[PDB]
Scaffold this active site. Structure first.
Site, PDB file in Angstrom:
ATOM      1  N   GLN A  36     -46.835  20.515  -3.682  1.00 50.17           N
ATOM      2  CA  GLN A  36     -47.513  19.268  -3.578  1.00 50.17           C
ATOM      3  C   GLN A  36     -47.423  18.386  -4.940  1.00 50.17           C
ATOM      4  OE1 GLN A  36     -50.512  21.997  -4.212  1.00 50.17           O
ATOM      5  NE2 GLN A  36     -51.996  20.463  -4.882  1.00 50.17           N
ATOM      6  N   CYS A  42     -53.875  19.998  -1.641  1.00 51.13           N
ATOM      7  CA  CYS A  42     -53.632  21.225  -1.199  1.00 51.13           C
ATOM      8  C   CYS A  42     -54.154  21.373  -0.018  1.00 51.13           C
ATOM      9  CB  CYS A  42     -54.692  22.126  -2.170  1.00 51.13           C
ATOM     10  SG  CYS A  42     -56.362  21.606  -2.315  1.00 51.13           S
ATOM     11  N   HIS A 174     -59.731  24.616  -4.797  1.00 53.20           N
ATOM     12  CA  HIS A 174     -58.234  24.719  -4.522  1.00 53.20           C
ATOM     13  C   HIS A 174     -57.915  25.323  -3.036  1.00 53.20           C
ATOM     14  CE1 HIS A 174     -53.901  24.240  -4.916  1.00 53.20           C
ATOM     15  NE2 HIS A 174     -53.703  25.398  -5.042  1.00 53.20           N
ATOM     16  N   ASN A 199     -49.051  29.662  -2.415  1.00 49.81           N
ATOM     17  CA  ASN A 199     -49.354  28.458  -2.929  1.00 49.81           C
ATOM     18  C   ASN A 199     -48.673  27.481  -2.581  1.00 49.81           C
ATOM     19  OD1 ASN A 199     -50.874  27.109  -4.744  1.00 49.81           O
ATOM     20  ND2 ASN A 199     -50.809  28.422  -6.570  1.00 49.81           N
TER      21      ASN A 199
END
Ligand SMILES: *[C@@H](C(=O)O)[C@H](O)C(=O)N[C@@H](CC(C)C)C(=O)NCCCCNC(N)=[NH2+]
Length: 236
Positions: A36, A42, A174, A199
């Site tokens: 990102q 996120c 997150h 992630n």
């Protein structure tokens, strides 16, 4: 919105299933990580990941879809100034599918304007369900990767390989995916259980994008609120 207990039984029935290890990455269920960059999105990556997986898992098709479009068009969210996983899934439905990022590429915090009809073929989610925090390994095993929250922190950023057992965030802050869980034995014999997280900070980070956070056999242990919020898109 479909309750989990009715969804879960159609896909499980029985087994019984093993609580030591299942890794979707290894069985054609997780598409590559993305980055990102700078751009608080996120929620966009965490959400669209889970749908990419379902198209992978439940109909072969490898498809990668635009979190930019979602950043550009999800008005229940705040583009780079944040968002929520559910809101995302809802906005997808209202938008009626997402473009394959190959047509609608990502430009992080670089100002951009929504454009639904920027790709002839879209990619939808029928509905989405919440996974209860007490039933994650169960969910993963039969339903698929899970878009989930977590209180990230500095110690979490410096992760590079192995099982994370460092310090935790102040609040849920997150979004990530759960893609699996595992266990290695290391004698001081001691069975060490962990969840695998995907992630959105680029493959350079941790194990090609992923990270392993400590847990227990049950998977009731959730380090850094791992999945106090937990959703999986249904496309079936
Ligand atoms: C996630 C990231 O890229 O770090 C991004 O900041 C985000 O959306 N985070 C979430 C945290 C959840 C646990 C997913 C978040 O803070 N959502 C609320 C933002 C919406 C309210 N903010 C504004 N500016 N209206």
């Amino acid at each position: 919105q479909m309750n989990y207990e009715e969804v879960i039984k159609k896909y499980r029935g029985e087994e019984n299933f093993d609580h030591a290890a299942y890794d979707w990455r290894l069985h054609s269920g997780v598409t590559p990580v993305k980055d990102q960059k700078n751009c608080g999105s996120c929620w966009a990556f965490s959400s669209i990941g889970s749908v990419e997986s379902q198209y992978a898992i439940r109909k072969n098709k490898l498809i990668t879809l635009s979190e930019q479009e979602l950043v550009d068009c999800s008005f229940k969210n705040y583009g780079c100034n944040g968002g929520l996983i559910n809101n995302a899934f809802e906005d997808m439905i209202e938008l009626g599918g997402i473009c394959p990022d190959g047509d609608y590429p990502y430009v992080s915090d670089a100002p951009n304007l929504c454009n639904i009809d920027r790709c002839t073929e879209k990619y939808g989610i029928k509905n989405y369900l919440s996974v209860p925090d007490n039933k994650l390994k169960e969910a993963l095993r039969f339903l698929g990767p899970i878009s989930i929250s977590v209180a990230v922190s500095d110690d979490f950023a410096f992760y590079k390989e192995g099982i994370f057992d460092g310090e935790c965030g102040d609040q849920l802050n997150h979004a990530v995916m759960l893609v699996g869980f595992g266990m290695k034995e290391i004698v001081n014999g001691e069975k060490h259980y962990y969840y695998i997280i995907k992630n959105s900070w680029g493959q350079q980070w941790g194990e090609r994008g992923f990270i392993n956070i400590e847990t227990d056999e049950s998977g009731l242990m959730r380090k850094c609120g791992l999945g106090t919020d937990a959703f999986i898109p249904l496309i079936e």
